[PDB]
């Protein structure tokens, strides 16, 4: 497998975190994967020409859709789930939740599961 690490990028500030040395702050494989996941979610699909069709999501386009609330909930689940699962490190994403806190303004949760989160059987002959 041998996934590799990457460099931090504070999405709050929209800038790379760099040490006092001036070198960019490296970080772990798992940290890099979490960094990647948020970026892929925020990248719309088919539009940013640098990436292929695999990368990116389509959540923004769903806003203009005329589908009902429940239909939009399933589409959110499908879109987020499809976008994340392309990464090798993903094991499973699910347990989605939704809260239409206002009449038409939504908050939703979902839980991601890594490859390392798997449970291993203990036996040998």
């Amino acid at each position: 497998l041998d996934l590799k690490g990457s460099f931090l990028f504070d999405f709050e500030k929209g800038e790379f975190v760099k040490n006092a040395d001036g070198t960019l702050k490296k970080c772990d494989k798992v940290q890099a994967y979490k960094q990647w996941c948020q970026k892929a979610i925020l990248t719309p699909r088919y539009k940013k020409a640098a990436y292929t069709n695999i990368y990116g999501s389509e959540i923004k386009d769903l806003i203009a859709s005329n589908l009902s609330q429940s239909a939009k909930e399933l589409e959110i689940t499908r879109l987020i789930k499809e976008t994340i699962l392309v990464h090798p490190y993903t094991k499973e994403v699910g347990e989605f939740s939704f809260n239409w806190l206002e009449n038409s303004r939504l908050v939703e949760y979902e839980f991601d599961v890594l490859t390392i989160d798997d449970e291993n059987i203990v036996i040998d002959g």
């Binding site: 460099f7 790379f16 760099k18 040395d21 001036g22 070198t23 960019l24």
Partner: protein, 374 residues
């Protein structure tokens, strides 16, 4: 071959590109192993590579001076030059066998196949029956165009297929022809020659060209208007740049401007109609060089002198008819032999006709003089 002097900015170094790449950054570590250095180095690698392999090669193939493939052939085409094609070798097979035995044209006869050589095949060009003396000579070609066809004599003693009656076959002659494709090197000069040569028609150069086309004409010189309007003179020399033989003058006369006339063939020479062309040999003023030559290893003095004779002989062509022979130019030719390591290590006391002075031709052609080691 000729090199294209590309500008430096079109040949920037990768590191120079990378260094200019890192110049923009101000408050981030640009050291190796950093994101900025590591991420930008491949870009510099591609930018430099594209600049060199892309633009320079693209520009190079545009000109015939630095073209190699079909691009060169297209460039040669635009100025009328065409690469020579391969040809089959040819010759005669002396057959042997029972008189009356039939052998057909097109039969496959080869050389002796070996571990290091396949059966170099040949094709009979003639259908004939074995003659009175139990022999018959049949011409044949090489199935493969190129020098492979030009096999030696006696090599073709193999007949493919079951034909009895024939006792033996052989090639008495090492076959001839068998040209391969013209090389790039030869083709490039022909394209370069056509590009540089004006290639007019009716001008003095063409008269020289037609004169040199005649065999035996070493060097030719033409005077326009030697006797007024309509009058042309041709001044030819043998291969040694001496006075051309009268037959050579007659040959060049018949080639370019026959004196005899006919109603249909007015002159039918290479010269235009209305011209009045004269063909003679010029006054050959020898310029014998004498110097204290010092010669290098691995060379023969007489051979080196003949090479220097050929080099200076070329310079005499550069010298115009009635021109000025330059002592300084002769210093260039002599010293260049040393710079080229061509059998001369040192020289001194050079005197052309025993004088270190530039000589002016009086409407003559300088003839090649004797080179003397002092």
């Amino acid at each position: 071959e000729r090199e294209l002097p590309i500008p430096v900015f079109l040949t920037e170094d990768e590191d120079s590109v990378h260094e200019r790449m890192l110049s923009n950054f101000q408050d981030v570590s640009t050291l190796e192993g950093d994101f900025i250095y590591d991420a930008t180095r491949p870009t510099a690698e591609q930018i430099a590579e594209l600049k060199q392999l892309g633009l320079q090669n693209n520009l190079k193939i545009a000109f015939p001076q630095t073209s190699y493939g079909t691009y060169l052939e297209w460039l040669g085409e635009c100025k009328g030059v065409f690469k020579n094609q391969p040809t089959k070798a040819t010759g005669v097979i002396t057959f042997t066998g029972v008189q009356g035995t039939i052998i057909t044209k097109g039969t496959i006869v080869t050389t002796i196949a070996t571990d290091e050589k396949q059966s170099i095949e040949f094709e009979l060009l003639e259908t004939k029956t074995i003659g009175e003396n139990e022999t018959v000579d049949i011409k044949a070609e090489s199935r493969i165009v190129g020098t492979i066809g030009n096999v030696s004599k006696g090599s073709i003693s193999v007949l493919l297929g079951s034909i009895s009656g024939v006792k033996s076959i052989t090639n008495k002659e090492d076959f001839r022809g068998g040209t391969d494709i013209e090389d790039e090197e030869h083709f490039r000069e022909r394209v370069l020659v056509a590009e540089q040569e004006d290639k007019l028609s009716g001008a003095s150069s063409d008269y020289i060209r037609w004169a040199k086309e005649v065999d035996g004409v070493g060097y030719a010189y033409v005077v326009s208007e030697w006797a007024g309007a309509g009058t042309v003179k041709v001044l030819i020399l043998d291969k040694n740049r001496k006075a051309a033989t009268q037959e050579l003058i007659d040959k060049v006369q018949e080639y370019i401007y026959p004196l005899n006339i006919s109603e249909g063939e007015n002159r039918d020479g290479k010269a235009p109609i209305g011209a009045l062309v004269t063909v003679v040999t010029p006054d050959t003023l020898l310029i014998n060089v004498k110097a204290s030559f010092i010669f290098s290893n691995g060379f023969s003095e007489e051979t080196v002198l003949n090479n220097l004779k050929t080099k200076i002989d070329k310079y005499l062509d550069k010298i115009d008819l009635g021109g000025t022979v330059s002592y300084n130019a002769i210093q260039a030719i002599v010293g260049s032999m040393m710079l080229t390591d061509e059998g001369i290590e040192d020289f001194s006391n050079l005197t052309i006709n025993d004088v270190k002075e530039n000589i002016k031709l009086q409407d003559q052609v300088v003839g090649i003089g004797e080179i003397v080691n002092e």
